[PDB]
Design an enzyme around this catalytic site. Structure first.
Site, mmCIF file in Angstrom:
data_model
loop_
_atom_site.group_PDB
_atom_site.id
_atom_site.type_symbol
_atom_site.label_atom_id
_atom_site.label_comp_id
_atom_site.label_asym_id
_atom_site.label_seq_id
_atom_site.Cartn_x
_atom_site.Cartn_y
_atom_site.Cartn_z
ATOM 1 N N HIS A 258 -3.965 -21.384 60.537
ATOM 2 C CA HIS A 258 -5.005 -22.326 61.032
ATOM 3 C C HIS A 258 -5.005 -22.237 62.547
ATOM 4 O O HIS A 258 -4.029 -22.604 63.201
ATOM 5 C CB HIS A 258 -4.656 -23.752 60.604
ATOM 6 C CG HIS A 258 -5.824 -24.663 60.571
ATOM 7 N ND1 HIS A 258 -6.461 -25.087 61.726
ATOM 8 C CD2 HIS A 258 -6.464 -25.222 59.533
ATOM 9 C CE1 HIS A 258 -7.485 -25.860 61.375
ATOM 10 N NE2 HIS A 258 -7.498 -25.981 60.058
ATOM 11 N N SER B 80 -10.339 -17.703 82.237
ATOM 12 C CA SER B 80 -11.458 -18.625 82.040
ATOM 13 C C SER B 80 -11.447 -19.250 80.655
ATOM 14 O O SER B 80 -11.282 -18.551 79.649
ATOM 15 C CB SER B 80 -12.774 -17.894 82.198
ATOM 16 O OG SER B 80 -13.846 -18.794 82.057
ATOM 17 N N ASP C 53 -20.606 -26.543 49.398
ATOM 18 C CA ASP C 53 -19.810 -25.318 49.771
ATOM 19 C C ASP C 53 -19.652 -25.171 51.259
ATOM 20 O O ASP C 53 -18.555 -24.829 51.712
ATOM 21 C CB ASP C 53 -20.461 -24.084 49.177
ATOM 22 C CG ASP C 53 -20.186 -23.877 47.672
ATOM 23 O OD1 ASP C 53 -19.460 -24.688 46.974
ATOM 24 O OD2 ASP C 53 -20.660 -22.858 47.120
ATOM 25 N N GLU D 63 11.146 -29.506 47.293
ATOM 26 C CA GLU D 63 10.564 -29.817 48.601
ATOM 27 C C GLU D 63 11.668 -29.884 49.649
ATOM 28 O O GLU D 63 11.541 -29.387 50.822
ATOM 29 C CB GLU D 63 9.733 -31.113 48.551
ATOM 30 C CG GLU D 63 8.961 -31.351 49.872
ATOM 31 C CD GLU D 63 9.733 -31.979 51.021
ATOM 32 O OE1 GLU D 63 10.890 -32.456 50.816
ATOM 33 O OE2 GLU D 63 9.171 -32.066 52.154
HETATM 34 ZN ZN LIG Z 1 10.263 -36.150 50.810
HETATM 35 ZN ZN LIG Z 2 13.280 -35.597 52.178
#
Ligand SMILES: [Zn+2]
Ligand SMILES: [Zn+2]
Ligand SMILES: *[C@@H]1O[C@H](CO)[C@@H](O[C@@H]2O[C@H](CO)[C@@H](O[C@@H]3O[C@H](CO)[C@@H](O)[C@H](O[C@H]4O[C@H](CO)[C@@H](O)[C@H](O)[C@@H]4O)[C@@H]3O)[C@H](O)[C@H]2NC(C)=O)[C@H](O)[C@H]1NC(C)=O
Ligand SMILES: *[C@@H]1O[C@H](CO)[C@@H](O[C@@H]2O[C@H](CO)[C@@H](O[C@@H]3O[C@H](CO)[C@@H](O)[C@H](O[C@H]4O[C@H](CO)[C@@H](O)[C@H](O)[C@@H]4O)[C@@H]3O)[C@H](O)[C@H]2NC(C)=O)[C@H](O)[C@H]1NC(C)=O
Ligand SMILES: *[C@@H]1O[C@H](CO)[C@@H](O[C@@H]2O[C@H](CO)[C@@H](O)[C@H](O)[C@H]2NC(C)=O)[C@H](O)[C@H]1NC(C)=O
Ligand SMILES: *[C@@H]1O[C@H](CO)[C@@H](O[C@@H]2O[C@H](CO)[C@@H](O)[C@H](O)[C@H]2NC(C)=O)[C@H](O)[C@H]1NC(C)=O
Ligand SMILES: *[C@@H]1O[C@H](CO)[C@@H](O[C@@H]2O[C@H](CO)[C@@H](O)[C@H](O)[C@H]2NC(C)=O)[C@H](O)[C@H]1NC(C)=O
Ligand SMILES: *[C@@H]1O[C@H](CO)[C@@H](O[C@@H]2O[C@H](CO)[C@@H](O)[C@H](O)[C@H]2NC(C)=O)[C@H](O)[C@H]1NC(C)=O
Ligand SMILES: *[C@@H]1O[C@H](CO)[C@@H](O)[C@H](O)[C@H]1NC(C)=O
Ligand SMILES: *[C@@H]1O[C@H](CO)[C@@H](O)[C@H](O)[C@H]1NC(C)=O
Ligand SMILES: *[C@@H]1O[C@H](CO)[C@@H](O)[C@H](O)[C@H]1NC(C)=O
Ligand SMILES: *[C@@H]1O[C@H](CO)[C@@H](O)[C@H](O)[C@H]1NC(C)=O
Ligand SMILES: *[C@@H]1O[C@H](CO)[C@@H](O)[C@H](O)[C@H]1NC(C)=O
Ligand SMILES: *[C@@H]1O[C@H](CO)[C@@H](O)[C@H](O)[C@H]1NC(C)=O
Ligand SMILES: *[C@@H]1O[C@H](CO)[C@@H](O)[C@H](O)[C@H]1NC(C)=O
Ligand SMILES: *[C@@H]1O[C@H](CO)[C@@H](O)[C@H](O)[C@H]1NC(C)=O
Ligand SMILES: [Ca+2]
Ligand SMILES: [Ca+2]
Ligand SMILES: [Cl-]
Ligand SMILES: [Cl-]
Ligand SMILES: [Zn+2]
Ligand SMILES: [Zn+2]
EC number: 3.4.17.21
Lengths: 686, 686
Positions: free
Chosen positions: B625, B567, B602, B370
């Protein structure tokens, strides 16, 4: 009982005939008043037939029309700029229609305006390989020249793309009798052959699946942003015009320069088929001059969308669709398909009025602007993409029902191979000499599989018709079926009339009826089976065939594969895994509770969806199916493993082989990954 | 009874404490031996806890590490090229860990190598606005200079991106006590403040959601094609290194040139905060020299994926995930979250061993890498994208559980607002002075909504954590919850230890327990409710707020809106329709049969999915998104209607206003279309 037999028996050849006559008395060109009128008629009738809702979905898209007070034509000009021959301003109208108004004369939709003059070069079918020959073998330079190409073999837009990249300044398309005149049959009105004044209309866009050129990715609704013409998708950059073979003869007869490299370059005209450039000595100073004045214009189009709500799974859609717009009368294309769709809606509505509803929702569509680039189906699919990709079971196309009277022609996803085999075994053959025998039997006899004994040929889906957005962009299982010959000479000509069909193709409407049974039979089983009628194991079989084939193409370059460590092992591994997992899944599907059922039907529905890559193919974002794409050399033809195929194509000519083979490797990785990921959708879910 | 109460009561503060101590004794840097060992431990324990399957999913991704025999550092050099001051080679280790091995010294992951020397310019937080000031107001030219920026306000990668585009040749990041030293609290080990030798590690990539820089779009599996380093996604082009405030003081004290434009540009050091360039007269010939020798290296990472199969809907996934890799000991980040995840798995496994199974499948994840760019979650989501987009209900993140002890902090999709309000009303507040009162009550008192009376603040999701692929690329409803302050001083420093937590943040582990209840409570309701616990009407409310806000930004330019006919009517129309349709849908959902149920669930599950545009945002294909995207000026912050926001940003400086406002119009069309299309997914299905 309300079952498939009930549905099939309600279908009548005489109704198909009545509807075909009704749809082909006046021209229904997209964007015109008459085609809006027909839309409203069909909307009205589908309501009367019993559908739950029937609505018009309209869009404002780029269309193209000749200038009525400024005709398109081609000339031979002499050295004083004098026009000594002109091509025809219209096709001689067929008997009894010489007084019909609003017949659009032959033109190439989306041609830019211009009046280029220059020397002709004859490019055969203007295929990729034909241009390789001219340039590489014959050292002929097309730059600054007008090319003349015969229709056939490949989509016309690909001809014009090939011509542009060879540097041409104009393209003339014509119909050679070698391709459009069957030996021993009479020209229209006395038979089904193309007369010398007949001309094939058609658009010459290269949209690669984008739909309306001004709004790629989004529907052309009321508040749409449009690209400026200069940024539009797919528009040709050189003038283009089609002619018949009488006019072609005049332009080809004076051709000088090199002779045809071989016999595959000569058609049936009493002409040398010299490649040029320019005319022979005597006429060396005469030139060809095009006069193109057509205009592109944002115009409203109308799709008719009918809904028959499902009794049990209303949020699962089976779609039967085909187009309504025609170049002129549309006696085969598309009305021979629209009439069949109309009779199918009528039958389903007959079961509905007696209290029956299909298990899943059936949507019926009459698409507009198919002839201008699949515009109507594409804009609708763009607007409804979220519903379609989470709810779409299958799409069955319904353009022209007949293009011949010899045998059936089916093109579909492998998921529907078993469905078609089973359905055709329960249908009666309409064929001479097969009375009392199944459609399956006549079809496999007349069109045998190249691979398997006792099986019929079923071809791939490419593009060039309204299924393309559903299959190639969205990954909804799709199919098509028609009657075909052993396309057809009058294609996209004014001679495609009701009389052509009724006299020469299908007088008893028995082939139309057979097609209505196959299309309607498919829709019924898709909309009504409790387990969806797809067989994943059939995909496994074809994936191995396509992997074998793409490997065999690469293996024409063994040294490069060694040098750059080009391995297909990942792709064959993925295909093997798919085969094993699909075998297991099919065991569970027969060994297996409605949630299990609903969960399981979802694995089947989303299997085609899994072959979609959200990043699309290189420089073609709207072609997303990793297994099938329209051929980059022929929109009409399906290509397997297109990404790897295009990476390999002409690779021996690429200047940086390391980079080129790196891209082949990248495409193998993407294909292997996608096949494994599709396989994994059929694993147990948890 | 096996209900939510049973689940919640099984959770114990003392277990969370035991697990946190267990996970924080040695460093767990991604790609190292110790982090593979911890992966295997967690795999083993989750099996023992009772999960159905627990597998390691590995990938080979680009990581970055300092050179052990060639340390990174910064110098002041005199005119003889003599190094008169050097920054520290490591942070002084905390008490009792001065003999721990394999503590990675402070570095900026993915910095290129180099030894640039030049004159310093002080750029405040290096925000977009800070660079506008330097260039536009103060006419300071950063080209060829080394910038020194204080951490804070925005993601560090955006600082380095901003610095690169201003033409800097090096960036030095440091922690100013103004931002990282709370008044009146003692520095570590005697309190929770940052000591002057402490340094914040962190990656400086600008991946825009791509994941592994070498394999954007596809998992980094065994047969993956990798981009060459030169084509990698997101890598900075100038050397970068972080320092503590003792070292920063030495570099800032000699700064000459212009004074700070204002007080918002001065931190708390006993220094002028002069912007430069260069040092004052006496020291004018001294320069700053960086020495960066880190290397990027493809390295294996390991995610742990646990499955608890659903009893009724096993093909519907609720995911609880958070990362395991840490910069050093990870006492808050991430182990304060991983310990909570471990105790949640333990509780669920306790219900499971007694015969209970949740309605839907729950997947638990311990993500790797991460800290190096969301690599582990991203590659897994790339591999499983088809399963996730057709089966993913919700994703709950679980990085650090505490970053303060003042109140709850929730960031989630509007779909889960009602769920969190209801859950927090049933939980006990752990807060001083709120004994016997609900978590809802303490939270709304301490963090009131800016908009509504008697409601708490709930923020948007942006990026900068493992939910980003699920929410921003795939459109799976996502949420996060933690305890926060009124980020934290020891962030990404060697001082983030078990002792920090146990002594200064949460000695009784009561705040950890509260967070375990909120995260676990959410997962339970998502995995177990018969109707999914989403309220579409809450999205309708926020869409109007965001439409009002983006309109208000555009309306700073009334003349241009008049000139270019800009617009927002389509977008407000779509928001109105969404509001009406969602009102109707919510009536049916309460008025409404398992297929109706399954069909209806769903519609709820695919509502977040409908905000995805398959074409992504401009030049950012992996941010799809349309409502939320990470801010282009701060990855951590959520932006609403990002496409229109970015089209408007600094538009008054654009050279071709017609083109610029054309793009604003295009983005309005895309947003209005997407909001309408999402609304239409909640209409009746047929
Ligand atoms: Zn973290
Ligand atoms: Zn971190
Ligand atoms: C088809 O399905 C099969 C599973 O039924 C699937 O097999 C998987 O293949 C991969 C190889 O691509 C295996 O990956 C190995 O995993 C082990 C850990 O389990 C690692 O130790 C291995 O790495 C070492 O060896 C490599 C090869 O020399 C080195 O490059 C590397 O440095 C390591 O030393 C390796 O990653 C995986 O374990 C199996 N899974 C099984 C058998 O269950 C196969 O990949 C599928 N095909 C496709 C195209 O997906
Ligand atoms: C919100 O939902 C409402 C429906 O509840 C939806 O209303 C639709 O609005 C469009 C306008 O964008 C309407 O479109 C009109 O349709 C009629 C045919 O029904 C046409 O005749 C109209 O075209 C004429 O008028 C235009 C405007 O001057 C001209 O530009 C044009 O040249 C024509 O002369 C026009 O296309 C549509 O009928 C309604 N549907 C209804 C009321 O049921 C609205 O669009 C939704 N909002 C969004 C953002 O989708
Ligand atoms: C095609 O058939 C349609 C439907 O039968 C005909 O349209 C009807 O014509 C009658 C008489 O003119 C009208 O009163 C009806 O309102 C029409 N019904 C519709 C449009 O639903 C149409 O005339 C036929 N066309 C041709 C060329 O024969
Ligand atoms: C096509 O028909 C065949 C033969 O009826 C179907 O295959 C049979 O399916 C039944 C029901 O599951 C099985 O019990 C038989 O073992 C199958 N026979 C075989 C494989 O030879 C097949 O499913 C049909 N295809 C469809 C409906 O798509
Ligand atoms: C964290 O806890 C784990 C699990 O209790 C400890 O790992 C176990 O250690 C014992 C004794 O060394 C071994 O026999 C087991 O096989 C281990 N179990 C596993 C890995 O599942 C681990 O020692 C603890 N770590 C620390 C730092 O206290
Ligand atoms: C949060 O709790 C409220 C109050 O209990 C829930 O709203 C009620 O839901 C029931 C069941 O449909 C309705 O009969 C009531 O009319 C609702 N009360 C209202 C709207 O004031 C709400 O559904 C819960 N949110 C969830 C479960 O996501
Ligand atoms: C048709 O031809 C002429 C101009 O060449 C004129 O009548 C009119 O402008 C044209 N119509 C167009 C360009 O649509
Ligand atoms: C071709 O048409 C042009 C334009 O109308 C005309 O000037 C010319 O005479 C025509 N040539 C022939 C051979 O009829
Ligand atoms: C092809 O021929 C034309 C003749 O005008 C020339 O201008 C063009 O450059 C040629 N293409 C090449 C480079 O072979
Ligand atoms: C229809 O079939 C018969 C028998 O071969 C044939 O005479 C006729 O040419 C066919 N029609 C077409 C259009 O192929
Ligand atoms: C670490 O530093 C030196 C070279 O500057 C040498 O030990 C080794 O090449 C380096 N390691 C790398 C580049 O990974
Ligand atoms: C900084 O380190 C370098 C390299 O080891 C060294 O030559 C120099 O003397 C050092 N300077 C100081 C002030 O210690
Ligand atoms: C900024 O200053 C540097 C000084 O070397 C100069 O080279 C660069 O072009 C300047 N940028 C501009 C064009 O303002
Ligand atoms: C925890 O709360 C108490 C009360 O405000 C305080 O003394 C302590 O500073 C807080 N801890 C942190 C890390 O904010
Ligand atoms: Ca469009
Ligand atoms: Ca990747
Ligand atoms: Cl068809
Ligand atoms: Cl979190
Ligand atoms: Zn057609
Ligand atoms: Zn056609």
């Amino acid at each position: 009982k309300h079952n498939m037999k009930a549905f099939l028996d309600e279908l009548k050849a005489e109704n198909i005939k009545k509807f075909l006559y009704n749809f082909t008395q006046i021209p229904h060109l997209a964007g015109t008043e008459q085609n809006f009128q027909l839309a409203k008629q069909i909307q009205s009738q589908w309501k009367e037939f019993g559908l739950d809702s029937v609505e018009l979905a309209h869009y404002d898209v780029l269309l193209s029309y000749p200038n009525k007070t400024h005709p398109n034509y081609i000339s031979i000009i002499n050295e004083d700029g004098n026009e000594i021959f002109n091509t025809s301003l219209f096709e001689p109208p067929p008997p009894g229609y010489e007084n019909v108004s609003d017949i659009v004369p032959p033109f190439s939709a989306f041609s830019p305006q211009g009046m280029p003059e220059g020397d002709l070069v004859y490019v055969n079918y203007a295929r990729t390989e034909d241009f390789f020959k001219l340039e590489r073998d014959m050292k002929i330079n097309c730059s600054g020249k007008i090319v003349i190409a015969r229709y056939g073999k490949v989509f016309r837009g690909n001809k014009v793309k090939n011509a542009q990249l060879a540097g041409a300044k104009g393209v003339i398309l014509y119909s050679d009798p070698a391709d459009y005149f069957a030996p021993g049959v009479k020209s229209y009105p006395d038979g089904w052959n193309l007369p010398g004044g007949g001309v094939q209309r058609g658009n010459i866009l290269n949209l690669n699946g984008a739909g309306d050129p001004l709004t790629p990715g989004y529907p052309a609704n009321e508040y749409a942003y449009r690209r400026g013409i200069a940024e539009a998708v797919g528009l040709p950059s050189i003038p283009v015009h089609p002619i018949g073979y009488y006019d072609a003869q005049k332009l080809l007869e004076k051709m000088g320069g090199s002779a045809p490299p071989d016999s595959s370059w000569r058609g049936s005209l009493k002409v040398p088929y010299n490649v040029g450039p320019g005319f022979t000595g005597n006429f060396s100073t005469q030139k060809v001059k095009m006069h193109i004045h057509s205009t592109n214009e944002v115009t409203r189009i109308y799709n008719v969308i009918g809904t028959l709500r499902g009794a049990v799974e209303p949020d699962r859609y089976v779609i039967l669709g085909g187009h309504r717009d025609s170049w002129v009368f549309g006696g085969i294309d598309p009305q021979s398909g629209a009439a069949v769709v109309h009779e199918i809606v009528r039958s389903f509505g007959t079961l509905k009025k007696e209290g029956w509803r299909p298990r899943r929702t059936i949507l019926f569509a009459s698409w507009d602007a198919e002839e201008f680039g699949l515009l109507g189906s594409t804009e609708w699919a763009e607007e409804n993409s979220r519903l379609l990709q989470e709810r779409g079971v299958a799409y069955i196309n319904a353009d022209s029902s007949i293009e011949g009277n010899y045998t059936l022609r089916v093109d579909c996803t492998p998921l529907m191979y078993s469905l078609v085999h089973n359905l055709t075994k329960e249908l009666k053959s309409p064929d001479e000499g097969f009375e009392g025998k199944s459609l399956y039997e006549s079809w496999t006899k007349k069109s045998p599989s190249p691979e398997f004994s006792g099986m019929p040929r079923i071809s791939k889906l490419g593009s060039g018709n309204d299924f393309e957005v559903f299959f190639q962009r969205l990954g909804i299982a799709s199919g098509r079926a028609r009657y075909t010959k052993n396309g057809y000479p009058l294609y996209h000509s004014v001679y495609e009339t009701y009389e052509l069909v009724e006299k020469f193709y299908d007088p008893m409407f028995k082939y139309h009826l057979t097609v209505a049974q196959v299309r309607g039979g498919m829709v019924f089983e898709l909309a009504n089976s409790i387990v969806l009628p797809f067989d994943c194991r059939d995909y496994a079989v074809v994936l191995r065939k396509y992997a074998d084939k793409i490997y065999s193409i690469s293996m024409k370059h063994p040294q490069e594969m060694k040098t750059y460590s080009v391995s297909f092992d990942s792709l064959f591994s993925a295909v093997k895994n798919f085969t094993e997992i699909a075998s297991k899944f099919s065991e569970r599907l027969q060994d297996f509770n409605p949630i299990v059922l609903r969960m399981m039907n979802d694995q089947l529905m989303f299997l085609e969806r899994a072959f979609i890559d959200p990043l699309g193919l290189p420089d073609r974002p709207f072609y997303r199916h990793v297994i099938y794409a329209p051929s980059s050399h022929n929109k009409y033809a399906g290509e397997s493993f297109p990404g790897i195929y295009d990476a390999l194509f002409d690779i021996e000519s690429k200047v940086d082989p390391s980079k080129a083979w790196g891209e082949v490797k990248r495409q193998i990785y993407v294909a292997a990954f996608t096949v494994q990921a599709a396989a994994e959708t059929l694993s147990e879910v948890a």
